Symmetry: none
Subunit: 273 residues, 6 copies
Amino acid sequence: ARGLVIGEALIDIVAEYVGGSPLNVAVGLARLGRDVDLLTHIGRDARGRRIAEYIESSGVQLVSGSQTADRTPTATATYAFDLEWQIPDTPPVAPPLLVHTGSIAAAREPGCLAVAALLDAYRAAATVSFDPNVRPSLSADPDLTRERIQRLVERSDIIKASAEDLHWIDPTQPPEQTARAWLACGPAIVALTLGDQGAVAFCAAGPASVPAQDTVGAGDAFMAGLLDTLWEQGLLGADRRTELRKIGVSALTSALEVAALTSALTVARAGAD
Amino acid sequence: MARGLVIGEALIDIVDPDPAEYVGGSPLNVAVGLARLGRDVDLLTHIGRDARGRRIAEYIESSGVQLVSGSQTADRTPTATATYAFDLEWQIPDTPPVAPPLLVHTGSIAAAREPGCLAVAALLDAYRAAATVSFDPNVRPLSADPDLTRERIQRLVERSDIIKASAEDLHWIDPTQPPEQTARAWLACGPAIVALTLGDQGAVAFCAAGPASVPAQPVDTVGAGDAFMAGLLDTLWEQGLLGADRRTELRKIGVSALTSALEVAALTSALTVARAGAD
Amino acid sequence: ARGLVIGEALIDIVDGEYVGGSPLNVAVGLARLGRDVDLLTHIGRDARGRRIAEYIESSGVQLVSGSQTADRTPTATATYAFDLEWQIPDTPPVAPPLLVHTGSIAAAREPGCLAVAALLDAYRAAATVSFDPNVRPSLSADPDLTRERIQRLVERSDIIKASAEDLHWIDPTQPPEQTARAWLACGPAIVALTLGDQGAVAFCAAGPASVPAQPDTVGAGDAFMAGLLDTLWEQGLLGADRRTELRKIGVSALTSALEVAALTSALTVARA
Amino acid sequence: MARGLVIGEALIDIVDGPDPAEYVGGSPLNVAVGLARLGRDVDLLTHIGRDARGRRIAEYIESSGVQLVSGSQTADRTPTATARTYAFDLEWQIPDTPPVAPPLLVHTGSIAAAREPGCLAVAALLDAYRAAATVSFDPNVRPSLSADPDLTRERIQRLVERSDIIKASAEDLHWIDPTQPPEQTARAWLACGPAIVALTLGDQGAVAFCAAGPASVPAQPVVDTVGAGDAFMAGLLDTLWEQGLLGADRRTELRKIGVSALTSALEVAALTSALTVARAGA
Amino acid sequence: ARGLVIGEALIDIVDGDPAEYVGGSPLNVAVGLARLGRDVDLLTHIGRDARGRRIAEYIESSGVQLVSGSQTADRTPTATATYAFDLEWQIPDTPPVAPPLLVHTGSIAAAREPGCLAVAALLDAYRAAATVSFDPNVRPSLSADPDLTRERIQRLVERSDIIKASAEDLHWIDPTQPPEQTARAWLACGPAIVALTLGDQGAVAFCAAGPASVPAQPVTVGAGDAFMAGLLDTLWEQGLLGADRRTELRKIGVSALTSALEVAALTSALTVARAGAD
Amino acid sequence: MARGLVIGEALIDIVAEYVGGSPLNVAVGLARLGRDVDLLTHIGRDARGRRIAEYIESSGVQLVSGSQTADRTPTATYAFDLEWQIPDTPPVAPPLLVHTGSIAAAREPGCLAVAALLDAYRAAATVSFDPNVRPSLSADPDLTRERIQRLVERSDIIKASAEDLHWIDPTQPPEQTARAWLACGPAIVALTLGDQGAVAFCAAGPASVPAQPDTVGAGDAFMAGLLDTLWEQGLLGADRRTELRKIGVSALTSALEVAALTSALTVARAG
């Protein structure tokens, strides 16, 4: 039972910190006690070394070819990105239970093509999960990225997005309307965070909600808590795809609760220091 | 005294801890709910002449509900076993012995299960010259023929004055729209009022005059939902809006009147739950 | 550097007399928040008008010349009975007003409403255009003309504020949030929507904002509108040369403006 | 002595336009008339009125040698279908239990299989007659949709599960599932209990599926697609009757029909349809 | 009422003192539509050299109006015989014509940077006024990331009202599935009509109302483009082009679609037969 | 040098007794088309065994030593009377081409040898397979479907009829099953469609030949023609396997045509 996460690790330059939404999920899952493979695109520079030791000291196995970048991608704080996203297209691990992607990795050439291939490869074995995590401050035109998000929605079992992500995707529609249009395209679960208004999620059986409980990584800790509780309910792996789609409102409500409490806990432990 | 008529299923819930048997059916709970708030109510149902049947009849009589003649012709009293399996027939006489009622309430399984759902549809049409028509779809999970179920619910929407549904009901009716979109599309088809319960977020209702809202309160969600429906009909009854002769005044209900009808329904539901949880 | 408000001022007469009019209340609200404001409405040379005129003056609001040439001061008698004409000069004696606000009966009642639409297009070169539908259907008129006039004002507006009740009446088949998002996509920078004791939401290109509740019915909304316009003024987002900055308002900045608007309304109620 | 029973609508087709006319119609009525014309004894349970159109339909039925089942003439007015834009003035209701001896074959389809309240009684009659009779079904969705634009697929699938022989058109099965080639739908129908699912492909001929395998017949070189399909159905049922495969008695032999016997049934169905058309030619 | 075709115009050099011919899939559709009596504008990328002047004259003789900004290429594109390309595709993304009834693109113009980004923009600019038609016509020999190619085809499929493809195009798009299934799947992304040519087996097409087919014609280069011109010309005549008719185009009946395939198959066959003469 | 190997049943068809068995027919077909072929069969020493042995020799095929070990030569008449057994290791030099199918791929015991034998010969030979479904040989159909699927995974060329694939999976159209079979390793899957002609699937795209204006001798002779023409094109042997996988639609079309005409020509030349 191993999980594969594909996406960007980077340095958040405000003082410097280790980040990347796909990395936060990898380390969130690991810290909750899952076996996680994290194939990223970092450098062999000081920043790349700090990332690799942050990944190492967290229990996430860094997949080979993840350290081939010219320079380690950075985000300087309304962010400014100096980043390339490119990955080896060869399936690097034995078929996982779960393959998760999103953020810059899902939408940025040339890695976004490899990512979508690898998703197409591992789908017969793995639950596919994906989070929009729209970082619009990136240097890339809006149409290709909206279209690539819509194509990853069509290939996904589990989706998490923010009201902010879905407002960017389509400002003309309430985020619930967009999430419901996403559920109708194939996913078992579309989870939607609503900030100070809580979270909602949608499956065939009905809507689930958790009431209201603004800091970096809260969304990725939510996703990690969601995939971790769905793992624990025995609904991950392609073997269990039919049972994921059939998840009850009660089970969905529980998962949401856990994901929301896991996100709050991560924020409250960070604000304690 | 003006009388209410409820048309729908009465059954035994068999709960498979300490296996137990409870009297249920949403339309039965609404009849029983209206009777306990002091209304005169007939129930037209379909139960057998065995133990379960005689218990439903005793529980009905005990609460002040009159069982309509022709209700006791089933081979076997319906049951639902909680994997929620059902052993149910729904059939009713095309022409029941009932004098024109002030209000007709139907829905649940009675509204969508063959062959009785055809006669339920025809009776709502015949009783609307005298009666306010109310409808609670209350989709019981399992329930087959999704599309046929949706077509039959839509035809009852077009013949109803008052509708109450849950967020879950309307998600099942149309998963691509927020429940409020479906409730407002229902209002546009002829109802005076469409009320929508939202669990721990309270309830909303729509009328021509505008939207109404009530916040949530502090145990079965459908048991609570049936007491909400009885409270809503009892309060509109008290406001003097029931009967074909009051249909134009019901359609013209104010946001304020509607808001009070919703608060009363909410308080009535919560009180039914709080009194039952204390035993 | 002044605000203009175009629309009705009336006396509210209860069942069995108060100075009212939704635009008047926004003008007074802006004045009482310390903004220079002109109001160009229609009030009689009679008893009612003088009380309106002195209420206006007492607030710090300059009445616009050509407004007091009214056959009878318009009246609202509580349901509501309207004894009212709405007429304005094709061209008012006032300079581009940094902001021009209209709505309510003025935007839909003839013959006055035809000038209003023309004036909003002409004032757009120097002023931010704000609009509050504040629907009052008691004063009857072809319902589909009312809706056509409102939609044309929406197209010429930078800031819209509306109630769930207003957008229910505009289109009872959609939730109010859907109507508000459709309005936003027709030109405005900001559509604000009040939802009673469910608080308020607002929409802008950057995203949605909200404030929760509890922090007069018509009077309240008018003071919300004044407080919204006052905060956007203070943020430096009003005037034609600030239009692109208004369209790009941040969710944080729009959340601040909603909070000030909600508190301004609540504080106006509480003080009276 | 063995008799066939057809349960379905009989109606008047009204053509509104240049040089207007009224024709006897109804897919199930055509099948009954087609079987009677091939020499079979056939009863037709339908719903017509005792008006001018009803008598005309009744006369047409008796001239073809079809026996009208008692209770078929209680309609308030004979159903009609008008092509101006398709408009239907039709009611479909039948006695829950008709006065008919156990037939060898019971055929239904079209509007009668999907229009309430009559369709409920039709589904119950198929379940009760299957102990003695072979059940045949022709979805014939085109007119059903023209009538009920909101028609649901669940009505058709329930009849699939009760049927031994199904004939449908590519157009029928496209409507049932537009995401799949009609052959995929026909094979899914076959796996639900039928002995035979026949699929007409217009000017590409016809295919059929049974447990033993697929059969096909090429297109005829050569109008009236709704009138040719009914003759095809009549010829398929008549030839299976001839091969001794009808009656609950031979249900296991009908399921075990070989590709060769199925191919021959299809050729006879296709030629019967072609010949029926060619004869209308003059 | 004007069509606008956007695509590559190039010279087909034969393998062998060989000969050169004016070619390009979109060029052929524009010329084909012009020859059937329709007013067509063609936005392309050619040079001011000898091959560029040959294409321009050919366009001019065919009745097609060349669109301003089509002759800014460094050198006229070339395809030589499997084919070898010396091609550049770049076009202004600024709408150069009054909104047309119909905007058609396909082949290399769809899948090749930078001009493919412009093609997507112009289809987005004109869709409110124009029918969008598209012919995948895959030319894999033109060295490209095949996943980027597939993605850029899908993004045109999502924009299109009318698609025509070969069995061989859909095979390359998705080897695992019968072309009939890729076509049915394409109809599900928005199109009104997905027509599929099956060579010696005839052609089929898919709309909301059902499938249509036409048998094998009793009879090589450009037969596909002539089929497309013939399909668009009959849909034009049936009154189904223009965004104002987009709802009626989706509601097209099997009978009307069948007619359009028949005219398309005969138009293709007549273009071959006339070429087998000369 | 280059020799073909066919592994499977040779039997007696009794209506009047005839030499038959589908693998025997492919071996005979190949020999009659001028190819050198070894047949590894399971025949008896009796009046029918020596009838089969005589037919095999008079056509130019060579028996594979240890074939005539059967107590009784197997029989058709269908009500099957036969056993299927082979030596784990045939006395055979590495062939260019190994072909099996029919009862030999599914009937125990040797049906267990056949699958390992194909994996061993794959290093030098192209592997071909014709399921030629025949259920009247009663046996557990799910292990039959399992054995067929394992052979599919180790084959380079597969030929099947619509009837064969219908029995494999009746819920799918035969082209769907054939395209699914091609994804498990094969370079070519050929599918005969009775009087609708034949199609074949490879990586480069589909081929078709229309119907020809008849025993299951015809199917076998189609398979012999297909193998014979892929031999001539230079695509048989392990060292040509990548060129076989990359066969063009044009070349596959030509192979389909030669195979359809070979089949057509075999039936007509008999009647």
